[PDB]
Amino acid sequence: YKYSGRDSLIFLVDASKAMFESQSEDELTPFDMSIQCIQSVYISKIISSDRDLLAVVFYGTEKDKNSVNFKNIYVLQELDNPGAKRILELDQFKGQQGQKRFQDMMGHGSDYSLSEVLWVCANLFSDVQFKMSHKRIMLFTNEDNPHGNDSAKASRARTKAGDLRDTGIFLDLMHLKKPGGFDISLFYRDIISVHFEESSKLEDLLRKVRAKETRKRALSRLKLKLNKDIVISVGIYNLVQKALKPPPIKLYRETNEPVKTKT
Amino acid sequence: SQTVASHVPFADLCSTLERIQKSKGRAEKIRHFREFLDSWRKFHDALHKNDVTDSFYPAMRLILPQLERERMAYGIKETMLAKLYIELLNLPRDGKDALKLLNYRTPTGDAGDFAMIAYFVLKPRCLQKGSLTIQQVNDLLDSIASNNSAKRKDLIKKSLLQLITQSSALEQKWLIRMIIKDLKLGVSQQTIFSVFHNDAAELHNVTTDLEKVCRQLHDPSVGLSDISITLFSAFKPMLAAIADIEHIEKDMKHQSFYIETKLDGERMQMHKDGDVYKYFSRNGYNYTDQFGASPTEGSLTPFIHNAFKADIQICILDGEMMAYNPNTQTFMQKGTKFDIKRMDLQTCYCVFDVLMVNNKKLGHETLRKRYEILSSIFTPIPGRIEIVQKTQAHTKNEVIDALNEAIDKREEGIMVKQPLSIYKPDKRGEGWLKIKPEYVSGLMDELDILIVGGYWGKGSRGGMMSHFLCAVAEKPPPGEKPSVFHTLSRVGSGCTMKELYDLGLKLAKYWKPFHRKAPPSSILCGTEKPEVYIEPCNSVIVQIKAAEIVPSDMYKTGCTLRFPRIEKIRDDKEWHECMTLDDLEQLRGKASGKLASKHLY
Amino acid sequence: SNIFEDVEFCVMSGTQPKPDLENRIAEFGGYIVQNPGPDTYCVI
DNA sequence: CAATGAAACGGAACAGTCAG
DNA sequence: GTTCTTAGTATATA
């Protein structure tokens, strides 16, 4: 795909009272699981593809802010190049004290509508200006039926989700964990691209890697010529490079400012 | 402090409009609007019960959006309407709904009705809700207009996001209608004025201010005494009806009259109070920015401020606006190469009537008293300001001679007016008559050309091809038929809908989709491309009558037709009997592009 | 406070309003050495 | 039972914008 | 024109 384009992954977690304190046992917690997954993938993406875009946005909350001032949606950190200033923001929520902070700052988890949630994430992708190579949405929920109560909400959900599927945006959920209710044919077989109570697809997002990559690119295009007359077009590409540590930048001791060497 | 529109949800207005539209009868539409306005005014009295600025304006500017003047133009019609709904609703850019919205005139029984099409697209999509009231609706429209004027398409999209989200399908239908400024209620605006007040229409004809109408005429029982034209207030100019040349003397009460040339420019009225000047177009739009609010600014006001007499403090003038050529000392007719409202030519205002002198209203005085007042209120400056010179006559032969003189001078026509007629704003005729060469049968050099393109219609003519692209042929060798055609102009008027339906049924099996990257060889195209094309051998000759041949950068012939319409569908002629570029050039050069060069006898 | 001028500081944990700590010092004129060099000696 | 009126539309031309 | 990506060109330690 277009090289200057960049990968963009948005994070979206069920903020209802459903999984905020599910904790059937005392060994895990879905929010402490989803936030752990987000922190791990986001710190890995720091080193891996620092040029890309990430964003975290919770839905069903009680406090509100977003681009369109809707109900029960919180854009925690917008789409931007990854950075530590957000590693800390995510880390602020990791913990039982952290979940206390989260609940008393945004909410226990009010009513919601994934139609409007997808609305919000779509607006987020629309907002930023850099061209996007791939566009992926990660849900974090286990309420496998978002609402069996208001069918109109669910009809609006298929409609908007199909639209997003046709605006160039993919969507994905990993079924985190639920006592029963661990199926995807219930309202999601038509959304995502048999089943169990936990997703293998989220385990690898903890593999915690520090590789880095560069996309399909020539080192140099040179015209191979069989003789003085026959010439063919060859792209000299590289398949092993011996990565070195990123070159350090000189900082003035105390301002931490760049120092702009002037030899 | 508060307003009723803040308490009247927009859904109620939508329900009233839907009932009016679904009503078959004028009585039923009238009675619907009865209940709406009566409930409104009852709520108004209850809410206020004691100075007031709130009026029916927040709702009436929506019921009659074509009359809106406070709000600036939205910049959005059907096309960015479809585009914005696609983008904001994030529809698949190649999906069925998006393609139907962008091609609402192409049938896929509501073709050409962007309302129905968007409503059916949105009905499953956004069962949106929560009762926006009239004044939030007004505020969001104000925001859209202010962002369009402020060059903020993102803020336009923002405001439209709130509008789309927090309104239902029927509400958004009606919103789209109000943005387009076309409701298709089936009820006449003069009906709504007689509804609102017995003097509503008359006050509108002199004010062009919906807020003023609502504010002064809120009480249906309290009627104004002397409604007249006021300074700096845009009044609707009075018009001229098509005259009967054989009955012209009878139409003028068998008494003496004036005959004068029809100027080919733009209608404009002037309001002066010393150094402050205001200008209003025929539709009431202000162009004082171009023309000059002070004798130090504008293309006209510095050149005219000294033309008035010393005692002229307040003056309202009605006249025609044209461009003056200083080198040739003649007028350049409106159209190509210039726009008089946005300009080595110089600005020139010719005035044919007055409505206001310092303390004397001149609407109800005879046009002769008015003209005598014109002849004394200011000294003409040639090429800057002139008096439109009315020439006296008493016979139909004088009318015919003046029409022939206008034809010889390549003029548009002649104005013939009643000396004893008062100024009647927004009245067609009632003393003023207009005569043109195209109004007389046989004086016209008409065009038999061939249909080569087709376009889908809209509105009442939706679902069928309401207009076509026309071309002229290349001269073929003797015995041979033409093979290459050059497009000349588009025509879509002159045929009854039954004739249009007959022609569409006849030609339906021959239309081919037009590809800009693969155009047909028999039909070359200029900048203007048709939606569908038809091979010449399967097409039909149409007889076209148009005012003149004017230069054009949209058609390969280098020219197009001004005011074209179909006179006859020439079924008696074959497709190869279409005229040639030689005939077109001969007609263009016969009378300097004017197609009327024959006297009336 | 004109006292804490001419004295070089390094306030570099304390997250207490961490950024405000230097602001609290700035109004005391404390010479913030926002990263400690050999010139500064005390780091908080 | 229809003449008289409108209103509805059909381009005509302009320019600013956005894409590219 | 901007940024990038090499390299490679340099220097320094036992």
Added chain:
DNA sequence: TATATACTAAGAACTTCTGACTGTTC
């Protein structure tokens, strides 16, 4: 006399006004 890091030096993969559109108006 090694190899390691720094540097800087350069090359390449990333912009370059014009066309078309829609309104707006009559």
